[PDB]
Amino acid sequence: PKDARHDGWQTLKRFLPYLWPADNAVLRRRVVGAILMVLLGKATTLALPFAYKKAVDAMTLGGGAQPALTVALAFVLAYALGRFSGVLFDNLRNIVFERVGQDATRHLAENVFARLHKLSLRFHLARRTGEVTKVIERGTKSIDTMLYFLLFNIAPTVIELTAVIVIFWLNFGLGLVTATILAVIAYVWTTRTITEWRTHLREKMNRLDGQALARAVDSLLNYETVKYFGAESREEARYASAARAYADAAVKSENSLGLLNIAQALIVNLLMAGAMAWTVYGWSQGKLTVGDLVFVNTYLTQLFRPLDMLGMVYRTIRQGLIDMAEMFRLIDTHIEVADVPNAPALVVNRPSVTFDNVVFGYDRDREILHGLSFEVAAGSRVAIVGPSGAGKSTIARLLFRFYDPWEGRILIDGQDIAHVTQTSLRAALGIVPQDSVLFNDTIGYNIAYGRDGASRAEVDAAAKGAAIADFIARLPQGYDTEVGERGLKLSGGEKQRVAIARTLVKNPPILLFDEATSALDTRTEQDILSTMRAVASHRTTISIAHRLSTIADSDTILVLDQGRLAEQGSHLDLLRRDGLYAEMWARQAAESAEVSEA
Amino acid sequence: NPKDARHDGWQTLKRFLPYLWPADNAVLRRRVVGAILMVLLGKATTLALPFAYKKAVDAMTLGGGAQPALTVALAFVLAYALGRFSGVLFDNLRNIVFERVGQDATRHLAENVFARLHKLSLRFHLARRTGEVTKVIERGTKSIDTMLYFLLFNIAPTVIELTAVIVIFWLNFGLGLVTATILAVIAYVWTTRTITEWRTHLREKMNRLDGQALARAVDSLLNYETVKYFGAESREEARYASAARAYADAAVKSENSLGLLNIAQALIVNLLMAGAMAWTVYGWSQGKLTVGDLVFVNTYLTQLFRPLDMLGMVYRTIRQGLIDMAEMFRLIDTHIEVADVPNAPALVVNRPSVTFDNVVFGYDRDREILHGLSFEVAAGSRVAIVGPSGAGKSTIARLLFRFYDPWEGRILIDGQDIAHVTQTSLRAALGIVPQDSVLFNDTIGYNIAYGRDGASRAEVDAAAKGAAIADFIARLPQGYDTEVGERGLKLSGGEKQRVAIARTLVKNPPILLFDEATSALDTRTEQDILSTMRAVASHRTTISIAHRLSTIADSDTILVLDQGRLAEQGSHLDLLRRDGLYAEMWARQAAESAEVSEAA
Numbered sequence A: 001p002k003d004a005r006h007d008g009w010q011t012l013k014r015f016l017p018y019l020w021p022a023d024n025a026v027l028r029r030r031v032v033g034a035i036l037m038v039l040l041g042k043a044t045t046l047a048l049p050f051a052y053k054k055a056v057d058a059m060t061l062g063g064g065a066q067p068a069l070t071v072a073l074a075f076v077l078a079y080a081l082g083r084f085s086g087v088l089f090d091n092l093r094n095i096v097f098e099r100v101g102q103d104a105t106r107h108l109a110e111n112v113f114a115r116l117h118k119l120s121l122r123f124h125l126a127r128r129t130g131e132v133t134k135v136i137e138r139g140t141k142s143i144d145t146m147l148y149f150l151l152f153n154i155a156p157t158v159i160e161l162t163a164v165i166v167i168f169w170l171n172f173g174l175g176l177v178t179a180t181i182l183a184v185i186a187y188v189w190t191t192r193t194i195t196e197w198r199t200h201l202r203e204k205m206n207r208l209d210g211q212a213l214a215r216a217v218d219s220l221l222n223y224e225t226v227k228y229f230g231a232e233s234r235e236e237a238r239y240a241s242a243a244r245a246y247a248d249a250a251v252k253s254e255n256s257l258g259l260l261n262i263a264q265a266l267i268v269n270l271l272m273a274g275a276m277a278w279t280v281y282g283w284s285q286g287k288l289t290v291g292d293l294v295f296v297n298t299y300l301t302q303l304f305r306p307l308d309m310l311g312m313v314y315r316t317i318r319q320g321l322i323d324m325a326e327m328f329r330l331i332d333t334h335i336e337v338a339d340v341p342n343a344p345a346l347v348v349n350r351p352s353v354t355f356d357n358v359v360f361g362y363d364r365d366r367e368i369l370h371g372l373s374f375e376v377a378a379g380s381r382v383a384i385v386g387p388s389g390a391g392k393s394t395i396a397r398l399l400f401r402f403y404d405p406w407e408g409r410i411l412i413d414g415q416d417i418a419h420v421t422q423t424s425l426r427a428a429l430g431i432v433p434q435d436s437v438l439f440n441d442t443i444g445y446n447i448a449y450g451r452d453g454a455s456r457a458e459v460d461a462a463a464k465g466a467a468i469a470d471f472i473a474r475l476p477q478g479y480d481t482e483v484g485e486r487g488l489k490l491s492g493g494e495k496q497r498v499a500i501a502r503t504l505v506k507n508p509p510i511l512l513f514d515e516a517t518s519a520l521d522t523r524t525e526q527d528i529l530s531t532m533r534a535v536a537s538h539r540t541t542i543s544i545a546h547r548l549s550t551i552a553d554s555d556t557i558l559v560l561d562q563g564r565l566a567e568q569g570s571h572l573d574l575l576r577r578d579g580l581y582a583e584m585w586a587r588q589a590a591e592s593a594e595v596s597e598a
Numbered sequence B: 001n002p003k004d005a006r007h008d009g010w011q012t013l014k015r016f017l018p019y020l021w022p023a024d025n026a027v028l029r030r031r032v033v034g035a036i037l038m039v040l041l042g043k044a045t046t047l048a049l050p051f052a053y054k055k056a057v058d059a060m061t062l063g064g065g066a067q068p069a070l071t072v073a074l075a076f077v078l079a080y081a082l083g084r085f086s087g088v089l090f091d092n093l094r095n096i097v098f099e100r101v102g103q104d105a106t107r108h109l110a111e112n113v114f115a116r117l118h119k120l121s122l123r124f125h126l127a128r129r130t131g132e133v134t135k136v137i138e139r140g141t142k143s144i145d146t147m148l149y150f151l152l153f154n155i156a157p158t159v160i161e162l163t164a165v166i167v168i169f170w171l172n173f174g175l176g177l178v179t180a181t182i183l184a185v186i187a188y189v190w191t192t193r194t195i196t197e198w199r200t201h202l203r204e205k206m207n208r209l210d211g212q213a214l215a216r217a218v219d220s221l222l223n224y225e226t227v228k229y230f231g232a233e234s235r236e237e238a239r240y241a242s243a244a245r246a247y248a249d250a251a252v253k254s255e256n257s258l259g260l261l262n263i264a265q266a267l268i269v270n271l272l273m274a275g276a277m278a279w280t281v282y283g284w285s286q287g288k289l290t291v292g293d294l295v296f297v298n299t300y301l302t303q304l305f306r307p308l309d310m311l312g313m314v315y316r317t318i319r320q321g322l323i324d325m326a327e328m329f330r331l332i333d334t335h336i337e338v339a340d341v342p343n344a345p346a347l348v349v350n351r352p353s354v355t356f357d358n359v360v361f362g363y364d365r366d367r368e369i370l371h372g373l374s375f376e377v378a379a380g381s382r383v384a385i386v387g388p389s390g391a392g393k394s395t396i397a398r399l400l401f402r403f404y405d406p407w408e409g410r411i412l413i414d415g416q417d418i419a420h421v422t423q424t425s426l427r428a429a430l431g432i433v434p435q436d437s438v439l440f441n442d443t444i445g446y447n448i449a450y451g452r453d454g455a456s457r458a459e460v461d462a463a464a465k466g467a468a469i470a471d472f473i474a475r476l477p478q479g480y481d482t483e484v485g486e487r488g489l490k491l492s493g494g495e496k497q498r499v500a501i502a503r504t505l506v507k508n509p510p511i512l513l514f515d516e517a518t519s520a521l522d523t524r525t526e527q528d529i530l531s532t533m534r535a536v537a538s539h540r541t542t543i544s545i546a547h548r549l550s551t552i553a554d555s556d557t558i559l560v561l562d563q564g565r566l567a568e569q570g571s572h573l574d575l576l577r578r579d580g581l582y583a584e585m586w587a588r589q590a591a592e593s594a595e596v597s598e599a600a
């Protein structure tokens, strides 16, 4: 299976079930019809040169223009109709097959999409929208062009080349056969080597192009700064040098295309000269008719027409196979966090959260939690704080099981979250993260995202609870207002309110505020804190905060130091104990004073 | 005037022609001539080679006077093969010879537009998204290149060959042959064009559906965490799938139409082939034509219609190219709001005073902001300009750098109207630390050296020191060679502002503007950077435009604007004593900070 050479053959054999689905009957029928079109088309293009030969034969055999006019007429007509029929068959196979192609590449993409959602967070999917888009565009284009060239150029040419070998064998040579075979081998080898060199030149050109373009764009988007320093000539010279470098590379890349074409024509035309001279010589001895000259010439040109593109074809097919392999690699990549076999659903009857001796790090060379243990009572409002090495920033990710502990475990109610389904576990948890993100869609879509079947009543209710309802009401399109980019831009508080609303639609027993106010300004922070407190009403709530004053009203505060639970208690108990929390508090307090001094 | 004409493809091409025939270079003109010569050799060759095939066939079938016919036929078969190879050689040689001319032409067009865009007004607000603009420019470049290649190396050669075939068919056949082929070419072009219009519309729909499916997929992938938090994997999968199906449907229709165009084309071509060949054989029957004539006619027709096999695509590309190029020329034609007057002298700053003399201005003609603003900034003084929300203070710097001109009134530096001097000297006299400094996608050292064209490593080190960012840079692993901006290391607000300060230090202008320089900063960063700003403002004329009065309280004098005019002027203490607009503002601002300080 996967236990193979990992060449194009493996990738292709892997792709084969997509083309011959065994899910879909209609598509299989389409495949068969396309293959029939290939065969009819080839039979037609192989037959038509014979008709041309006979027409010439009739006009040379040959005392006069006698009953032979009728014969010659019939045969040229057969030839022309043959040409049209060949093209008709080719275009009909493309037309029949196209749906199969489209479904196959769609299903491949969907499989990759699904596996990517199953894969680990640590792949760190944080990148540029335009760049990933450019990569995906280039790649889909790649796989499509490859697929088309393999099925509809290379394969028909293999059939045709074999047929020409047999026919040339039975009717000529067999010096003809070896001559053509050598011509084809020299042709492919030359095209291949020249193409490898060409692909390198292309890559250099593409890079230089990107550089000239980047300079131009950076300049235009910094028009103000350029004016401030009167730097127009400078930026112009800067674009110009880059542009020249690009143009030089482009001239080389294109010229190499000229060289490939010339090499190809040399090979074809040596073959043509040889075949035709030899055919004429065979004519002189009465072995071959004059029509044979026409016949061989047509067979050779027809054979070498698809090979006119072989370079591009080669490049394309190669790249496609690469890209497709990349796809399959993702599908194969193993999943770090998985449900255990026959994992039960998590049943939340009493929403306690337990960390039991948790040892964890994102990477095995940097341990962060060194045996963290704590208990959060059901329905309590708890805070988790600490200085720079505490490891509090792992809590949310562990609770949602983005990762597993190296040692120890997390429990919700009485149950190890590692032994339940990921879906039930996440169904029980709400989060308002530090940087809330909006989908490129309406505000209603964004709020309703909290639960799958969320009704507009639920959206209104959540928006009310998050106290963002009025702001939406004063929008012309209300809930149907598009947001994100390209959409309406929300303030930080408005975004955090959309996130809160989203979690309200979910209505989870356990709610986490994960540095929820850390990006907000002071007034925004203070405003949203009453909403958060209200929204924590009958939930078990865990708030991870940098700034202690924002969580001082907690039922209890867990203080972490060096990946372990250092101190525990109410804000007052902790101030009395005069330990780490008190120091932190004093420190922050002092700092708040200093800023106010200015 | 060539611009005084209909706005079509012909005009665009006529505009582009000087680029191809520079009259600056001569080397390139010689290259163009050489390329045209290769077109002619190539056409003579491809026209000549079928006669060689014809003769070879003629020799074999009429060996009466063409003897030894084996020798004659061999010679002709070899002439035919050599003719083919030679045709290809001539064609690739015209491409190879011309390519430099093409690249230079399009480079010069791009450079012309680039210069023009830097000349055009700020109000166009060119700052927009990088990826979108880049994708557009890539698409356009490919478009114009492809158009140029198809125009020069496909359409034009085919026009030459078509005329030649018409003449040759005329002289040796028909002339039913001539009319048949011409009608065929006409039917071919008309069919291809009309089918291509439909095809292009389908292509656009396909592309739009493609972009929507891709955007859904990308939004999901970059929001993997959110998708996880809400268990939305199935929803995202289904949401991608529906879009993907819409795209696949569009793609299927779009590809299928290509099959239709190919069939229509082959139908036309093959009617012409059947008729022409049948006619040639019938002419043979009457002793009018040789059998080699059949080979000759057939070969001529296939050679003719081979470039036309691409006519659909060609038509789509050339058209698109012509559109894109027109857009280029449109930008080049767009007029320049702010230009130097003819023969403008340099601004000569011997004593760097600044005057606003009765200035009336607005960004737009329906909304006037300054209503007769007048003030004098003494040479070497440090002054501030403050006011409430409609004061118009945010126009001052833009007017000084002459991003816009006054509707009425004028601005002077050292007694010289800045409207009447070269823009480059004027801007040479001015330094600015703006509210949001922007960095080039380049090294931090490049960004600092940007202050002056020939900036040495020493000048940069000195500026980094004066801006007090030198230590921060020293602690960078790559130092001055550290890449910054987007696509690079992220600097804090203070670090960026310090880079801006360092830039102006490298420039060393006589007049310095702080244009809300500290307004985006946090309080402590503001307090830190203010001492730096005071140091660099040492012996310069400094004008500080600030929202928060406490940051400018130490000014030599303060200009208070209200409603686009100068309401109040004087020292901070004098303004507090007058108990007017500045005092009110001062009190108000103090009050707010107190309340803010209260909320700890």
Ligand SMILES: N[C@@H](CCC(=O)N[C@@H](CS)C(=O)NCC(=O)O)C(=O)O
Pocket (backbone or CB within 6 Å): A191, A260, A261, A264, A307, A308, A309, A310, A311, A312, A313
């Ligand atoms: N022979 C070259 C391909 C030649 C080629 O690309 N020809 C057509 C398209 S298939 C073209 O791009 N331009 C038409 C022409 O100038 O011949 C190769 O093997 O890659």
Ligand SMILES: N[C@@H](CCC(=O)N[C@@H](CS)C(=O)NCC(=O)O)C(=O)O
Pocket (backbone or CB within 6 Å): A152, A153, B192, B261, B262, B265, B308, B309, B310, B311, B312, B313, B314
């Ligand atoms: N006849 C159509 C299509 C021509 C076409 O696409 N020709 C080459 C251009 S590179 C090609 O791709 N042929 C497809 C094939 O033979 O596989 C037109 O006039 O544009």
Ligand SMILES: CCCCCCCCCCCC[N+](C)(C)[O-]
Pocket (backbone or CB within 6 Å): A105, A106, A108, A109, A135, A136, A138, A139, A140, A143, A322, A323, A324, A326, A327
């Ligand atoms: C309908 C087409 C669906 C197929 C999906 C193909 C996307 C291609 C991405 C390949 C990227 C691989 N890489 C890194 C080598 O560029």
Ligand SMILES: CCCCCCCCCCCC[N+](C)(C)[O-]
Pocket (backbone or CB within 6 Å): A209, A210, A212, A213, A216, A243, A246, B110, B111, B113, B114, B137, B138, B141
């Ligand atoms: C916004 C459209 C106008 C952009 C023109 C500016 C010229 C620089 C980029 C165009 C050509 C660069 N390229 C792609 C050939 O390297």
Ligand SMILES: CCCCCCCCCCCC[N+](C)(C)[O-]
Pocket (backbone or CB within 6 Å): B106, B107, B109, B110, B136, B137, B138, B139, B140, B141, B144, B323, B324, B325, B327, B328
């Ligand atoms: C000379 C090379 C520079 C190429 C610049 C790209 C041109 C594209 C202009 C886009 C304008 C919109 N349009 C023409 C597609 O309708």
Ligand SMILES: CCCCCCCCCCCC[N+](C)(C)[O-]
Pocket (backbone or CB within 6 Å): A109, A110, A112, A113, A132, A136, A140, B209, B210, B211, B213, B214, B217, B244, B247
């Ligand atoms: C990170 C890139 C590799 C995986 C790509 C994700 C699969 C879905 C890609 C969407 C394909 C776009 N198209 C052509 C179907 O519209």
